[PDB]
Amino acid sequence: IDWSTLGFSYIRTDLRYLAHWKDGEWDAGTLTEDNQIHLAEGSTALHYGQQCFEGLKAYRCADGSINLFRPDQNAARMRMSCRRLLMPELSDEQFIDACLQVVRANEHFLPPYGTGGSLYLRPFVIGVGDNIGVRTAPEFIFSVFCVPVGPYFKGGLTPTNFITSDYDRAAPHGTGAAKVGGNYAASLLPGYEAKKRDFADVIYLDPATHTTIEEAGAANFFAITQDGQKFVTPQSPSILPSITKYSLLWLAEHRLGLEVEEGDIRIDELGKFSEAGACGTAAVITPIGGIQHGDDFHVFYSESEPGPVTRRLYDELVGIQYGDKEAPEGWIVKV
């Protein structure tokens, strides 16, 4: 129970939410201790990747309350992921409700305020039931389990480097915009090579022709311009719509009077920005010390220090998440 060292590893919490879909409708759903999934050997989820998931965090505020960050946004996104894979959808009603039931039942795992930790929720859907042909499963399972994670930066916003790859994580018109297992399995090998060559991860350029930046592994990418006034993130049908990215996209315009733009970010002109970063629920902005592309490295601001704008974005979001800052209208749901 030592929130101190605690990292981002699996830990068996008390209860999970579990719902079955059959004959066209979802069931009431229930809480279980099982933490073990059982499915037909021919399950579509094991052979054809008919699986998708979400990830969000719950936090314990100073005033003793509990914050659930934009659960609705994840519900909307998972609906799209299920859409792409022919799986039944879940309404904000059912999605948020399951997340709430799980946070409450496992409240004793919510890291106490002070230690930058939180409760990670892993909602997911998978196809099940007897099967061999390439088609959608006759049945599906929806589950939500949580695991207490600790502060990602057990020291502070420490920047790390990334490297370019010739491998793709998504096709131009594949499942890139959906949070489906297939995309992660494809990044698995290139990710192993990057870590090996002592790098944080890899930055995928773009299926068609590797000229523009897509995503920085399992997290979106953004860059502040030299003048430090304009916020830039890549726009593309093949990248995952990061909820953190969109929130950082908001905090920049309505909390930092900065210019904002969703467009192309060629790997030719990186010197066009003063600082760059990778954002995500787990990542929560990883300052990018430098990007290795070919035989030349390229640092933006520093390789041991986060740029100012980046730090401001980091602190504003973390503020909202924990409640030490007014939360925008809509975001944050009390548990």
The annotated binding site is made up of 48, 77, 122, 134, 152, 179, 184, 217, 242-244, 281-283
Gap between the Cα atoms of 324 and 257, Å rounded: 20
- Please choose which of a second copy, ligand PLP, none residue 243 contacts, taking the beta carbon within 5 to 8 angstroms, the exact cut-off set by kind: ligand PLP
Burial group, residue 79, by CB count within 10 angstroms (0-12, 13-18, 19+): middle
Give the contacts of 120 (CB within 8 A, at least 6 positions apart): 8, 55, 56, 57, 146, 147, 148, 149, 282
Tokens of 142: 């929806």
286 binds ligand PLP per the rule CB under 6 A: no
**In the complex, what is the shortest distance from the CB of residue 324 to a second copy, in angstroms, rounded to a whole number?**
27
Of 213 and 240, which CB lies nearer to ligand PLP in the complex structure? 240
Nearest to 111 by CA among 75, 61, 74, 71: 61
Amino acid letter, 225: T
Sign (positive or negative) of CA dihedral 63, 54, 81, 40: negative
By CB under 6 A, name the one of 151, 277, 280, 307 that touches ligand PLP.
280
The reply on whether position 165 binds ligand PLP by CB under 6 A is no
Using CB under 8 A as the criterion, which residues of the chain lie in contact with a second copy when the complex forms?
A: 8-10, 12, 16, 34-43, 45-51, 53, 84-86, 120, 122, 124, 126, 130-136, 143, 145, 147, 149, 152, 166-175, 180-189, 191-192, 207-209, 217-218
- Are 137 and 45 in contact by the 8 Å Cβ rule? The answer is yes
Nearest to 149 by CA among 118, 113, 106: 118
Residue written as token pair 């602190």? 315
Q: For residues 235 and 283, what is the distance between their CA atoms, to the nearest angstrom?
A: 20
Give which of ligand PLP, a second copy, none residue 244 binds (C-beta under 5 to 8 Å, depending on kind).
ligand PLP
Q: Which is nearer to ligand PLP, 66 or 278 (CB)?
A: 278
Does position 321 bind ligand PLP by CB under 6 A?
no
Task: Please give the residues from 10 up to 69 whose contact with ligand PLP meets the rule CB under 6 A.
Answer: 55
Positions in 211-250 near ligand PLP (CB under 6 A): 215, 217-220, 240, 242-245
Binding site for pyridoxal 5'-phosphate, by residue number, is 77, 179, 184, 217, 242-244, 281
Minimum CB–partner distance for residue 2 and ligand PLP (Å): 26
Are residues 234 and 278 in contact, defined by beta-carbon separation less than 8 angstroms?
no
What is the binding site for ligand PLP (CB under 6 A)? 55, 215, 217-220, 240, 242-245, 280-282
